[PDB]
Amino acid sequence: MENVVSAPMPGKVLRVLVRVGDRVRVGQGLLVLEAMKMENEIPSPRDGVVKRILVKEGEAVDTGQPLIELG
Ligand code: NA
Numbered sequence: 001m002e003n004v005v006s007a008p009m010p011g012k013v014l015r016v017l018v019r020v021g022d023r024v025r026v027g028q029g030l031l032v033l034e035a036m037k038m039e040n041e042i043p044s045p046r047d048g049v050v051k052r053i054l055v056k057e058g059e060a061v062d063t064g065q066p067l068i069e070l071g
Contacts, residue, residue: 004054005045005068007061011035015057018068022050030068033061042067 011033018030029041030050048070055067 001066003048003051003070004066005030005042005070007033007063007065007067008042009033009035009040010060010062011040013055013057013059013061014039016053016055017041018050018053020050020053024048024050024070031055044068044070046070 014032014034016031024044025047028044031042033040051071052069
């Protein structure tokens with residue numbers, strides 16, 4: 001899915017760091033997944049604007065699951 005940031009591993013959503021409409025830059029933390037016994041910031045792969053937030057706190061996600069859509 002183009003413009004979609006997806007989960008790199010299974011985990012639990014701890015918090016979302018951005019809001020719809022936010023400008024983001026490559027490497028910027030978009031949300032935090034608990035996995036591999038740690039808290040992991042999931043980065044933006046590119047500069048952009050946050051278009052949609054596709055998960056909520058507490059949600060269990062799988063590898064490749066859409067997390068954030070960029071505009
Ligand atoms: Na799930």
